Amino acid sequence: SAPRIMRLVAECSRSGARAGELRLPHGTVATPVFMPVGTQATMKGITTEQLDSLGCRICLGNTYHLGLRPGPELIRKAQGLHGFMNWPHNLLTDSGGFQMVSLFSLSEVTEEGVHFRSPYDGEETLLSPERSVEIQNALGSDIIMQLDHVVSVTGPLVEEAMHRSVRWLDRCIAAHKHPDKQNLFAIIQGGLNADLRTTCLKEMTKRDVPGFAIGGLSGGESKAQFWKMVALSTSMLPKDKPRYLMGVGYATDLVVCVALGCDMFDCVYPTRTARFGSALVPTGNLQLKKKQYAKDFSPINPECPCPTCQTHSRAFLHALLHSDNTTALHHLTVHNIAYQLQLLSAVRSSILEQRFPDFVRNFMRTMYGDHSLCPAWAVEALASVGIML
């Protein structure tokens, strides 16, 4: 058995929610953890020092966009993504086959790999499992993801893509020559089909990879199907390895999925709400473009430690959203990332002090009010692990 990268430091005595640590090459990461996308932060003017100061010790790189600009060869010459973008902490990259790739740019998947289209009937580009590993090797990220056959879908394609993802996992494992330097994660597929997802869990966990992600659940399905598939996945994934739930990041989703056994999360959308003027708060969000904030001289959240809340009022941000929008979006993006990192930090602290069910009750009461106003799916999911509201 390969050395384990995770240890558990505490488990909720009621629910089993996990507080852990990942020993990665650019530092230890506390779990549960929300992982922002680095380039989404740099697009909004966020420096390494600013993101470090928010407590971030791991962020995502989107392999498709990095592979377009600046491209893998340039990143290789820069001695990896850490060197190129001046980031000293950990990086997680995906396979580059589907995340943030338009379906307009994708031809049909074949056994050889993913096929990209070029404009105006140009020549296509193949991304094989082996080339995906080679690219991520050049990026030098601390966690690299297998190439999987992602589908949006009913019928035989779900089962066919699930089994192809298993075959591609094996090919990525064979291609990845330095597990001492980068950690390859498998990605559980099978859609919303319990039998297919059970099969994928049974087969992929026969491979001794350092971590497992839960794929195919970020959007489209009912909330009932969503949390049942998360719980199915965590019931079968190894306890002694991390569980990374991909594409999930709304606050309530995060809290519930930690309760269900997940360790790592990513999502572009809560932070991207900043682009529309919305600031994340324990009661949900403030829409700072609204006229009621024009003379509101309090910060977004007096108890938020982010630079925006230490420095600026709602009124100032409201004025900037209208008259100097680019500056406003920097401030709101900093704050929204801060909220996500603060939320997960508070979740983790509560597990360590064995008060996680109390934390969940306070989180839900602040966000929604009485239990009859809480989302029914979340009440049911929490009850399934013993947390009553």
């Binding site: 379906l103 009912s222 909330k223 989302p375 029914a376």
Partner: protein, 366 residues
């Protein structure tokens, strides 16, 4: 409200359900399939132009029960709420495509799931929800999980008769439900003795019709249970069946006295990106296949649906590859039109005494 048989031929009932009070429903026939109160991917306006649309639509309690509070405030019923105030609605308990988890039935309640959380329904809660929905017909609260052991099967019959008697009592006291029709539910699982008892005892109650529950695949053993059950039911009330929609299975059940079918099969075909092509006067084609990228024929040559008269396979292929909702719109239009045309051909075949020939035409293509 009356079922009048036009002709009975070889165990197959050809007729019409009248005074539904200017509305008619043809038998054998299907009910329009809906999800969360909409025909999937189709608007009121598009549905109007599909040829052969059934005279009654199916609603699913599992997709509507979580909206009870708003419907109760609306007061005027779910048909009006969803913008179809003059349409006829039958409300089933479960959705045949997304039936949710098993094992939650007791002698006191049944649970359903829509988008969000479990809705647990006692008899009084179930009837309160039906008072908000005010459907024209509704399946009675019932235990259909026997085969999901004579002990388990005997309980499904007794639970369902207790539910039936309790719901009939509450309907007597409900002003709004005086114009709604309860559908009795035949249970009993795969135990012949219980099936017959469920059939005979449910027929003793003043229900408007019967739902044959638990036959979803359809084995030859269950087909014999089915004909055994329908022999015990009165001729002058309609027989509905759930979870049976594929054309070959439909024909087998019609031969055994079943009148009304759910139309979720053409929806399933749409959701896998496919188009029904079987002749009723390949069985389906998969429009994601590369052979359709340059195919400028319609889905079905000679089809008069809005998809086939105005669009090509090539365009539908492209819409699927880019995940556009228009692909589901066009495929659903065609698949409903094709499936309803199949049911029209069944009734025409009964009129001409050629159902056996149509049955072989369908089987040939499978």
């Amino acid at each position: 409200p009356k079922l009048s048989l036009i002709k009975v031929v070889n165990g197959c009932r050809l007729g019409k359900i009248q005074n539904l009070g200017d509305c008619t429903v043809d038998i054998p026939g299907c009910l329009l399939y809906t999800r969360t109160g909409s025909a999937p991917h189709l608007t009121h306006q598009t549905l109007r132009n599909i040829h052969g649309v059934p005279g009654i639509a199916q609603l699913t309690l599992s997709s509507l029960a979580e909206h009870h509070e708003v419907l109760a405030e609306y007061k005027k019923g779910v048909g009006s709420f969803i913008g179809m105030p003059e349409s006829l609605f039958y409300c089933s308990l479960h959705d045949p495509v997304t039936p949710g988890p098993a094992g939650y039935v007791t002698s006191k309640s049944v649970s359903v799931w829509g988008f969000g959380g479990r809705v647990e329904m006692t008899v009084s809660k179930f009837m309160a929800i039906q008072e908000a929905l005010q459907p024209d017909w509704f399946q009675c609260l019932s235990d259909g999980e026997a085969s999901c052991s004579i002990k388990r099967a005997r309980k499904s019959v007794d639970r369902s008769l207790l539910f039936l008697d309790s719901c009939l009592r509450l309907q007597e006291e409900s002003e709004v439900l005086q114009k709604s029709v309860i559908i009795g539910v035949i249970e009993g699982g795969d135990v012949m003795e219980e099936r017959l008892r469920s059939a005979r005892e449910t027929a003793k109650r003043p229900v408007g019709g019967f739902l044959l529950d638990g036959f979803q695949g359809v084995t030859e053993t269950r087909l014999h249970l089915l004909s055994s059950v329908t022999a015990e039911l009165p001729e002058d009330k309609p027989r509905l069946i759930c979870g049976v929609s594929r054309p070959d299975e439909v024909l087998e059940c019609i031969e055994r006295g079943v009148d009304l079918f759910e139309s979720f099969f053409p929806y399933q075909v749409t959701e896998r990106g496919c188009a029904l092509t079987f002749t009723f006067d390949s069985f389906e084609i998969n429009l994601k296949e590369k052979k359709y990228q340059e195919d400028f024929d319609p889905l079905v040559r000679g089809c008069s649906c809005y998809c086939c008269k105005n669009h090509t396979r090539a365009y539908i292929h492209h819409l699927l590859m880019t995940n556009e909702l228009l692909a589901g719109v066009l495929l659903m239009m065609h698949n409903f039109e094709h499936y309803f045309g199949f049911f029209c051909s069944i009734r025409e075949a009964l009129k001409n005494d050629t159902l056996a020939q149509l049955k072989e035409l369908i089987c040939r293509q499978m």
